Structure formats: C-alpha cells, structure tokens
C-alpha cells in the first residue's frame, strides 16, 4: 500500500498521458508512446523492464502476421482470454480509430516478446470512433461478449466543424456489445444509461462490470456513480438490463487494478479538474455486489500532491504505474514517475 519513484534513463520522452499498460503473463508492456513508431521501436509497444525500482524500456516486436498499431493514448483497453482489445486511442495524428486492435503475445521465445495485433471487422451497429472509455469482456456462460461504455469522441462529419474540429462530445450513452469470435458488434440505447460519460474506470467481472466514476463533459461533471450491465448472451442474445447502484466515488480518469481476485483497487483519477483525487479508493465485488473500501492514501512527499495532474494505468498485477509533470529545465526531466505497490 505504498509507492516508489520509478525513473527512466532513456526513452523517458515516450510516456505520454493516456498510455495503456498491457499485462501479458505478468510481463508488462508500455503502449501509447509519444509520437509514432520510431525505428528504435517501429511498433509502439515497449518492453517495460522494471528492475531495482529503476525503469528501462526495451523495444518490442510484432509478428509478421500482425497489424503494427499506432501508439494510442486514452484508448479503450482490456485484458482477457493474454488477448487484449484496444479501441479508439486518439492516434497521434489526433484521429479516433474505429479499428479494434486485438493484441496477443505470439511467441515469448529467447527472453523477448512478439505480438499479434490483429484488427477486426464490426458488422451491425458499429461503435463510433471513440476514446477515453474501457472495453471489457464478460465471462458469462463461456460465451465471448464485450461491453464498451461509450466514452468521449467527435461528432459525425455531418455535424463537425473546423472552428472546433477537436470539439470532443461524450459519445451517445450506451453499452456497446461486440463479439470476438465474429468481431461483429451490437448495442442498445439503454432506457437506463442516459448519461454520456467518458474516462470511467470500468471494473470487470463475469457479467456485472461496474462503471465506476468518470467525467461526463456533457455538463462538465464527475458523476460519482455506477451502473450494472447484465449481458444475457444465449446463442440468440436478447436485450440487456441495467440496475444503477450507489457507492460510485468521484473519479474523472483513474487507474483500475486487480489483485488476482475480485478485490480491485481504484487509484487516483481526478475528483476535480484542478484538485486531483489524492485518494485511492477500493472495491470488492462478487456475483452482483460491489463496495468501496477507502484505503489510506499512501503518504507520499511534497511533490506529487502538488502536481495538478497525473496519468497512468495498471502495471497489471496489483500495482499502478503513473506519472506527474516535472517540467524543470526541459526547455532535462520530461516527467516524474511513480509506481504503486498495493499490499
């Protein structure tokens, strides 16, 4: 339940906010590098070598039959089965990606890695090009199905305008449903999900994925709240039901984290634009239950409290890699990073 000052010798100017952190077999993988594939890493993925609490970043490679992907910042990421899903991402050409990226680990041979970042085709009511949100599969009756709580994105070109070309308007409030033996997806205008939220930290479960917090720009609000999602997924899927719940804590864009159980910890996003969420609240879910156990905020030092921003994600197991702006003589350090070991 405490942290450490992870440091980066080189490639430090690669950890841009919104960067995912893939967790393959414990081995962790940076994703969402700054510019684009740089021939030091012609893919974007970065083998994330934490040693002696120092951080280094080896490159990483993709299979021949993979689709080299753009480094996505604030994408809709997941972790299920070794096999990821990555939607949106806000390509560093500031374009949102309708493309879904299924990142696996192909052949961890000779103490290295290589992935199969396959794309996918989405028949039916495709989900808009989005970002901020988090896709997550529902392990229900052993049938693959994925929930995509629409995050924030740009309007359809039938409505967009250059004066505010980057006007990001929270996507339509849904829980888009996407297959993974087909790649074809569906969705439903829920009578219950009537708030266009983005940057939630969707904690996963068999079916009761719980949509903790977020920041719905629809009124520039941080609705501390939740939402229930009951994927009825027979071979013929009928319409899901929702059951809103209380307990949701106010987080704008926080970091999920599992602990090899249903005891996920949710470490700080933002309770306020300029007053970030210095508190690390928890959860402990079951079949159709959820709580929040406010944990003692790891007593850090003068710096991170007064940073006004941070950014990161789960190192994967029970720990969170996130960083704060550290502009001193950069014109030097580009950031000041921090990992959080829980328990």
């Amino acid at each position: 339940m405490a942290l450490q000052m992870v440091t980066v010798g080189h490639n430090i100017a690669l950890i841009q906010p919104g960067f995912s952190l893939m967790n393959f077999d414990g081995q962790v993988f940076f994703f969402g590098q700054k510019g684009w594939p740089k021939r030091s890493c012609p893919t974007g993925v970065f083998h994330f070598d934490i040693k002696q609490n120092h951080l280094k970043l080896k490159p990483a490679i993709f299979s021949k039959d993979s689709c080299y992907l753009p480094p996505l910042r604030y994408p809709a990421t997941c972790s299920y089965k070794h096999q990821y899903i990555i939607h949106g991402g806000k390509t560093p050409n500031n374009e949102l990606s309708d493309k879904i990226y299924i990142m696996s680990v192909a052949c961890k041979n000779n103490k290295k890695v290589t992935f199969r970042c396959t794309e996918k085709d989405l028949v039916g009511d495709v989900p808009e090009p989005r970002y901020g949100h988090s896709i997550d599969v529902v392990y229900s009756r052993g049938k693959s199905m994925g929930v995509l709580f629409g995050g924030r994105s740009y309007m359809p070109s039938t409505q967009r305008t250059t004066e505010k070309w980057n006007s990001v308007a929270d996507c339509l409030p849904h829980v888009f449903l996407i297959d993974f033996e087909f790649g074809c997806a569906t969705s439903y205008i829920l009578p219950e999900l009537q708030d266009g939220l983005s940057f939630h930290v969707s904690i996963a479960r068999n079916d009761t994925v719980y949509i903790l917090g977020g920041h719905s720009l629809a009124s520039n609000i941080r609705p501390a709240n939740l939402y229930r999602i009951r994927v009825d997924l027979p071979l013929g899927t009928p319409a899901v039901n929702c059951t809103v719940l209380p307990g949701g804590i106010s987080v704008s864009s926080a970091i999920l984290t599992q602990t090899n159980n249903d005891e996920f910890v949710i470490v700080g996003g933002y309770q306020l634009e300029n007053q970030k969420r210095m508190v690390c609240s928890l959860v402990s879910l079951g079949d159709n239950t959820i709580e929040i156990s406010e944990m003692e905020t790891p007593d850090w030092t003068s710096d991170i409290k007064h940073s006004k921003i941070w950014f990161g994600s789960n190192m994967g197991n029970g720990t969170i890699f996130l960083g704060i702006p550290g502009d001193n003589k950069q014109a030097s350090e580009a950031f000041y990073f921090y990992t959080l070991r829980c328990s």
Partner: protein, 549 residues
Amino acid sequence: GSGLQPAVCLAIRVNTFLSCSQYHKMYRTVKAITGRQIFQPLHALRNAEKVLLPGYHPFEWQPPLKNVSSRTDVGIIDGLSGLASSVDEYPVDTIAKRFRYDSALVSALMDMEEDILEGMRSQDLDDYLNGPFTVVVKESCDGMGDVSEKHGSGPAVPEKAVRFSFTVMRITIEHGSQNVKVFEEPKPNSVLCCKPLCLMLADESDHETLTAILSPLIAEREAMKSSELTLEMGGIPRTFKFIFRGTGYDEKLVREVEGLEASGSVYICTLCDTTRLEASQNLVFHSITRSHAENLQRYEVWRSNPYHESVEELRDRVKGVSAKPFIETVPSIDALHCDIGNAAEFYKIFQLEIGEVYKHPNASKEERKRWQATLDKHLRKRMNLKPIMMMNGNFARKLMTQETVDAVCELIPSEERHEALRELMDLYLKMKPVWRSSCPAKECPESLCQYSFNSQRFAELLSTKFKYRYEGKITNYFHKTLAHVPEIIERDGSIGAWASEGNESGNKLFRRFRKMNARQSKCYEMEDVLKHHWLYTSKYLQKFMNAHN
C-alpha cells in the same frame, strides 16, 4: 483631404514595425506639434485592421464546404478547436491562436485583389473575367525555438513554437487555351507574402498537439480542394478554384507529417522512396513515386499488413512510412534547408580535407574537432565568416563561393583536393541557381537545362574524389539536389519560391512581434502576433508602401 487615411497609417505602423503603443507615442507628439489630424488614431486603423484580418469580406462555396462553418465573422480561432485542456484528455499545453484557412485565404485574396486585377488587365488581357481562378498556393510550417514566454497564466507551453504560415503565389484562369499568370508573386519567399495561419506553441518534435492543431486546418484544406471559393470582390464574383501546394515544410517536419522516419535513416527522401545506398550508387536517376495519397495508402498497408510480413520487410515494402501521413503535401523540397544542409556537409567536407581524410579515412572525434577549428579560424581571418552553433543561409551562400574554396584550399598542400573542391563548388553553384532561384527557367535556364549532366558529373565526382564520405551514404539534400530537382521544376514550376525560404524569414518577425510588437501576454500574445503578422503580410498595405513609384 485633411491628412491621411487609416489603412495608410496602418501600413506605416506594421510594415515598419511600429508598436501600436509606440504608434500612439508618435501620434500624440504629432498632435503636440502638427495639431492637424494625421495618423488616424488607434481605433480608426483598428477598425481598419478588422477589415483586413479575416472574417470581414464575405464569401461562399458553390459545392458547400463540408465539416466547416458557413460563417465569415471568424478570424483568430483557438487552434485547440474544442480540444478541452482538461486532465482527462491530453494535457495540451499550447498557446494556439489560429486563423481559419478558408477565411484567412480569402482575406489574402481580397487583400491582394488590386494586384490581382492589376495583372488581370496586363497581358493585354481582359478584366471582366470571372472564370475559375485556379490559384496555386503553398503552406510553410516552421518549428522554432527560444520562443520563451516566462510567466504565463498556467499553460505550461514548450519553449518552442511552430507557425503554420501559408502563402498565395500564383493565380490563373482557364482563358480558353491557356492559364495566364494573373499575379505571379515576384518574391514568393518574401515574408510580406508569408501568410501566417496558425502559430502553435509546441515542439517541431511534438506530434499530438501539433496535429491536434493542424487537423482542423488540413480538414479545411481537403474540403477546399473539392470546392471553389465563389466570392465577390471588385463588385464582381471572381470564382476562385484552389490547389494547396504545401512545400514550405522543413524536411524534418516533412518526414514527420507524412509520417516518415526522421532524418538520419537509411531511407532518406520524401521522394521516390529510395534507400540511402540506392542513393549513394545511382545518385542521379530517381523518379517521383512518393506522394501523400501513396503515403496514406502506404501507411494503411504498413498497418493492415495483409501479406503478413515482419518489421524490416514492411519498412522496405512501405519504403519507410511508419506513421500515418497527416498533411496532403505536394512532394517537393525547401531550397532553404537544402542550402543549409548542403553547406553543413560542405563544411564537414572542408574540415575533413584539412584532415586529409580522403587519405586517412577514419579519425578521432578530437582530430575532427581539430583541424576544423582551423577551418573556423581561417574562414574568420581570410574570409569574413564565423563559427555558428548551427548552419544558416547567409553563412551558406557566403560559403557556397569558389572564393570559399580558395579559402579552404589555402591550408591544404594537396592540389588534387584543391581542384576537387573547385569543381565541387562550381558545379554546386551551377546547380543552386536551378532550385535556389525563384524561377530558374526564366532566370538561369542554361544552368537548368545543363542540370542533368551537372548532377551526372557531380555524382561521378562524389564517387571519385569524396568517397571517404558518401561511401554508401549521402545526405537527404544531396539526393534531393542530384535528383528530383528537374522533376520538381517541371512538375511544380519552380523551387526557390515554393521553398521555405520565407517562412523562416517570417519567424524573425514572429519573434520581433512577440517581444516588441504584440502583447507580452499569457495566452493571447499569439492572437495579436498573428494579427500583426497578417498586417505586415497584407498586400492592401504593401501597396501603400511601394507607392513611392
């Protein structure tokens, strides 16, 4: 009568770099002495400015502009363009005040309209013609440094700016059999034709913020390509039609936006997709097969990976494009940076010849930094040229001089290397007037038509006498000069004009304004710097300045 007109004292304000606080100083002293009403006061020429800056002269499109607003009351817009600088999203720390490419472009048009029609009546040609003004334009984005705002209002911008600055260069009309040159800009590299559009506060290296700010402009542009700006100026609708030949992007940023690997790669060219070694060997025959449409398709295959190949196989199969092309550039180069790089390489070559490195191929970095400070000392005393942290243009053209070769050969007992450098620099100075010129075919056509064999003999020399360098290597610019030059000339029509020789010539004024002639503000210093720099760049004003005759 009774003194001046407002726009006139506006010209005498901006086209002489008078701060509109110092303008008032001059005005109030005038009142103290003159008494008469000259130099129409600040609010008068201010409501004049609002005329010249975009969003006053109205306009329209016969194919309706898609993804764009149908409003002509919008000048300085927030480049962030709805990219909320919240914590949830990317921390865009950029003071971005940008014009709109549609409104700004038409503002320049109606700003130059008197010149337009001046030329229109010339050529013994009509003035009534409303046909499609198939204008030809460039788009020059320079990324700069040492632009330090040191007490902002919270936006932690980088100490590095980048000013996407367009420029209109020629206007033509489908008059039957030909397209006349209505206003063939005399100095398309002159800052007073460097139309600023978007003065981001961001790194040339940054690639998210940069694109967050230039995705609106290129959306505007890709929609303009399809449309025709059917305005009405001179009390007549002069149907415009567009093509945005963006070339003024410095090669670094060129490779960037189109997505290519940064300079220093084994794939050095924004053109012909040739390797570094195929450049060192062939060195004269490379065909343009590397465009932005081809580049978008090429990144699309570098991702789709449909044949399922590995990294290097794809970099070879895409021929270099790793990222996704952003700007629909038209493949070309910047005579400016071409000269800067070629002269940096000649400077390396000169110090080396002082190290007789043609004999001794390899050497220690100390002996490089030595018998090279002697190059500096000698170009100090004999020639009038100094050491500079980074190469520049005055230094180049004062170095691209057979006199420079005499200066470097004053300290090389090797006569064969003397003649080597003599031929080298004479052949390069027969090349440079073919791209470094605003219009060679009209200016130096003999060098231009000899250029093919010029490049031939130059490559042959590179092989022969300068192989300690250029052994399986070459500069991006030595390839862009020893090839793609005639192709660019014939396809575009010139280089020295479309080149970025002016945008960088406009960064000087950008800094001059940010420091002197625009508010030392937090976030709207770019608002008034853009204003000021458009005003300097207003033909409607320059005409008042060439008025002497």
